[PDB]
């Protein structure tokens, strides 16, 4: 069996708890997983590198101050910024964020015409035409690789939901919570935190 | 050893005599309808499995509501803090929690329910039963069907199912199930809002009915505003 | 076109996110919308004219005393109560509103027969038999006015949801949150209040 766990891939199955409904729901699922995966690994890396929890990283960069981000990146040869000048600013990045992500979005979904105009079809999660220069889509069992990615997608989203609920309850951070649990698993758990209260009880 | 294969001819210690239906011919005049007898009033019927899921959550929430009720009546400890008693450390306290108990789970001294001991027994018993109920493990009782919430063989030793009308009893259980689940939801929301047990909230609401309500505690912000 | 924004009205096509399901959902959407129109408009007007938050307005009338509600009307020529505080009462307002709203609801749905004795049909929204003393429904484009009503329904409900979550977070009031936003658009928003922790973090 390809998918021995509880649920099954959309292509074949029944979706036991929630009905399958639209196929756009499956499109969203994959995209949510492909995103949350990047989010979870980014929160992991930010906690490991800087010790700053992900959920307050936005406090760092603000309209008045967005210079602190420059010195955070570990092992960089020169800063992010022009040193004292600190050209990077919240708005400086924001205009860049909105234009670049909006272009990437729209050329993905087909709100605007595809610039690549290379036969790629919008509304498919797996293009496999240009976004795989390495050819791992072409080679190997492509369907099995869709399965693995899906599994990683669902795991990462569930871990993301865990991360947000741990940020709400513990207020410490994902990796800080991981270190607390590993240092002592018996007396550092969700139920131990509930016994102590989540800061509200 | 030879094969005897005699006739047991044993009867149930108690076997309820036919009592039929004790309900009106109309069976769900309440909001909504039982599954397999009409259209769901509001929420869409997710799957055929959802009926059995409703039954299981219902029976579990019945048992949970009665447990919180009896625990608070017998000890005064709220159900949501009763977990803090039996822990890997100092699970001795959880023992003497039953009013009138001739003996303690923890005899005086070291003798005691260990959390891990209790836990290990809990996994080995409840998980086994949970699996045997569902398609996991196998079927130790072939005469019964795994995946059926109403087996009604060895699981009704008193034979109320066959003694009365089966389907009215089924809907009666379903109504009790939905009532207890909604009551359980009320209990968790009350625990969140007031930080006091269900019977404590009941007593506060009956001593002075006009105050000690949702909106009275909301006037204080549920202790958060 | 008719519905250029995201999504569509019940007859326009398939729902993007949640499948349409039962036909009664459209009726619930309209009724909820109309109630949210009333709710948002009341929350605005009460906060603008008086200044009390709508969420704490519940505590202001209580069976211990419901005279603070009296005379708290902008430009009120006629007092709500006599000079006597005793005549106005929380249960006096409650009993009449229970009987009036219960009658209105039962007549709208058909639990009890229509006293109006008009062509207005139960299990139906905006019959228009008598609810529109002015015939601009039929004189104007009835379908255009219906889609406009529905767009306002969805806007008012989404705004009410935002209002309740702002009350839970900011605890200052919807209109008061508006005032704070315009007073300082960049230092007063969600992200700034999240940096403050919504009063809990
Ligand atoms: C689009 C995705 C995206 C997401 C999911 C978040 C999510 C977050 N940001 Mg970030 N941001 C995002 C993009 C961006 N942020 C920023 C700049 C900031 C700032 C400046 C701040 C945040 C803050 C926050 C937090 C607000 C919590 C909240 O609203 O209550 C919880 C809400 C939910 C659970 C709703 C679901 C949260 C971790 C704030 C923060 O750290 O608060 C402590 C903060 O001050 N973000 C920029 C630059 C323009 C972004 C660009 O796209
Ligand atoms: C070229 C020298 C240089 C060196 C020795 C390091 C060294 C390090 N960096 Mg840094 N970085 C360097 C340049 C740069 N880093 C960054 C941005 C980052 C990021 C975003 C991350 C690191 C991380 C790391 C660690 C693991 C990287 C592996 O591979 C390590 C301590 C990773 C880390 O510590 O997170 C756990 C990480 O996530 N670096 C940028 C900008 C893109 C650089 C540009 O020159
Ligand atoms: C044999 C004497 C004995 C007596 C008189 C009582 C008397 C009582 N017990 Mg206890 N118990 C006794 C032995 C035991 N009880 C328990 C475990 C419990 C439980 C689990 C519960 C009681 C409950 C009750 C009450 C039920 C009243 C009726 O109905 C009552 C105060 C019930 C209670 O607390 O109701 C609020 C209840 O739920 N008892 C055990 C262990 C199996 C016992 C063993 O000897
Ligand atoms: C039917 C619609 C309706 C709605 C939605 C509300 C909603 C509210 N009322 Mg009101 N009321 C309503 C009708 C009426 N109220 C009152 C009389 C009161 C009183 C006396 C009080 C409220 C309070 C409240 C708040 C309590 C929040 C809560 O339970 O915890 C949160 C629950 C949720 C978010 C639900 C999910 C909230 C703003 C209380 C208040 O203001 O406390 C702050 C309060 O003390 N209401 C009367 C009688 C005339 C009503 C008649 O229909
Ligand atoms: C938002 C992301 C997302 C999306 C769009 C989907 C969509 C889908 N999944 Mg995927 N999945 C997700 C999350 C998601 N899932 C996560 C996190 C897990 C890990 C538990 C899975 C695990 C999973 C399995 C194992 C299976 C699916 C299946 C399916 C399909 C059936 C369900 C459906 O159509 O309704 C989609 C409806 C929703 C996504 C709404 C969910 C609503 C609940 C209430 C969410 C609860 C968490 C919520 C975010 C909490 C709020 C937090 C907030 C307070 C901050 C569909 C294609 C099944 C399938 O393909 O069948 C063939 C299948 O077998 N998925
Ligand atoms: C988890 C328990 C549970 C389950 C599995 C079901 C399942 C079912 N019910 Mg039952 N029911 C329940 C609870 C539940 N109901 C409760 C508590 C009540 C009393 C209010 C009812 C009252 C009821 C009636 C009156 C009827 C049904 C019907 C049905 C069926 C159709 C609905 C469906 O498939 O979608 C199930 C979908 C859901 C359960 C999702 C709803 C989720 C909401 C948001 C509630 C979440 C609760 C809570 C806020 C979570 C807190 C989280 C915590 C972290 C704070 C199905 C068998 C109908 C039927 O049989 O049709 C023929 C019918 O007529 N049920
Ligand atoms: C309770 C109000 C309500 C109701 C009954 C409906 C019902 C409907 N809408 Mg409307 N809609 C609403 C709210 C509502 N919508 C709001 C606020 C918006 C603006 C965001 C819209 C925007 C909208 C669009 C753009 C479209 C619809 C469509 C539809 C249909 C699709 C089926 C559906 O939604 O399932 C019934 C509803 C549910 C199952 C909703 C469950 C709740 C969801 C998952 C999350 C909401 C969060 C919740 C408020 C959190 C509360 C927490 C708080 C208590 C603390 C149906 C007629 C579609 C349509 O007509 O297609 C033909 C369509 O295209 N609606
Ligand atoms: C802005 C929101 C809005 C919109 C666009 C509509 C639009 C419509 N409604 Mg709906 N309706 C709404 C809000 C809305 N309604 C609310 C909040 C309620 C609850 C009271 C109703 C209750 C309702 C019923 C019961 C019926 C309608 C009907 C109609 C149609 C008739 C034409 C009409 O009302 O002109 C809309 C005109 C305007 C939006 C102009 C502005 C009017 C403003 C708000 C001031 C009104 C002052 C008023 C005369 C006196 C009240 C003041 C108080 C102090 C049309 C589809 C009828 C129908 O469709 O039958 C075929 C019908 O039977 N509506
Ligand atoms: C009709 C829609 C509507 C409108 C006009 C506003 C307008 C406003 N909101 Mg509200 N809000 C809304 C919906 C809305 N919100 C919803 C749906 C939510 C829940 C997610 C919130 C949650 C919310 C919080 C927690 C706070 C505001 C705040 C504010 C103010 C600052 C602007 C801002 O950052 O909001 C941003 C809007 C959103 C986050 C809505 C997301 C909708 C998605 C993208 C679709 C402003 C008066 C802040 C305030 O009071 O400022 C002083 C504040 O603390 N709002
Ligand atoms: C379905 C549908 C159809 C209609 O169309 C419309 C509609 C709106 C009615 C809609 C309805 C939806 C809804 C409202 C769903 C809600 C479901 C819910 C709330 C289920 C709850 C299920 C709850 C369980 C199993 C709990 C078991 C509890 C146990 C073991 C406790 C054990 C225990 C005890 C004794 C005391 C110790 O201290 C410790 C612990 C705590 C361990």
Residue numbers in the entry:
A (entry chain R), C (entry chain P): 33 to 233
B (entry chain Q): 29 to 253
What does the paper say about this structure?
Here, we report the structure and function of the O. tauri photosystem I (PSI) supercomplex in low light conditions, where it expands its photon-absorbing capacity by assembling with the light-harvesting complexes I (LHCI) and a prasinophyte-specific light-harvesting complex (Lhcp). Interestingly, nine Lhcp subunits, including one Lhcp1 monomer with a phosphorylated amino-terminal threonine and eight Lhcp2 monomers, oligomerize into three trimers and associate with PSI on the third side between Lhca6 and PsaK. While Lhcp, Lhcb (apoproteins of LHCII), and Lhca (apoproteins of LHCI) all belong to the LHC superfamily, Lhcp proteins form a separate clade with characteristics of an ancestral state of LHC proteins instead of belonging to the clades of Lhcb or Lhca. In terms of pigment composition, OtLhcp1 and OtLhcp2 each contain 14 Chl molecules (8 Chl a, 5 Chl b, and 1 Mdp) and 7 carotenoid molecules (4 Dlt, 2 Prx, and 1 Nex).
Among the three trimers associated with OtPSI, Trimers 1 and 3 are both (Lhcp2)3 homotrimers, whereas Trimer 2 is a Lhcp1(Lhcp2)2 heterotrimer. Trimers 1 and 3 bind to PSI on the PsaO and PsaK sides, respectively, while Trimer 2 assembles with PSI on the PsaL-PsaH side through Lhcp1 subunit and interacts with Lhca6 through an Lhcp2 subunit. Trimer 2 binds to PSI on three different sites. At site 1, Lhcp1Trimer2 has its elongated N-terminal region (NTR) partially inserted into a surface pocket formed by PsaL and PsaH subunits. The NTR of Lhcp1 contains an RRpT (pT, phosphorylated Thr residue) motif identical to those found in Z. mays pLhcb2 and C. reinhardtii pLhcbM1. The RRpT motif of Lhcp1 interacts with nearby amino acid residues through salt bridges and hydrogen bonds, in a similar way as those of Z. mays pLhcb2 and C. reinhardtii pLhcbM1. Arg29 in Lhcp1 might be acetylated on its main-chain amine group as there is an extra density linked to it, and the van der Waals interactions between the putative acetyl group and nearby amino acid residues from PsaH serve to stabilize the association between Lhcp1 and the PSI core. Sites 2 and 3 are located in the membrane-embedded regions on the stromal and lumenal sides, respectively. On these two sites, Lhcp1 forms hydrogen bonds and van der Waals interactions with nearby amino acid residues and pigment molecules from PsaH and PsaL subunits. The Chls in Trimer 2 and Trimer 3 form multiple interfacial pairs with the Chls from Lhca6/PsaH and PsaK, respectively, which are likely to help provide the excitation energy for PSI.
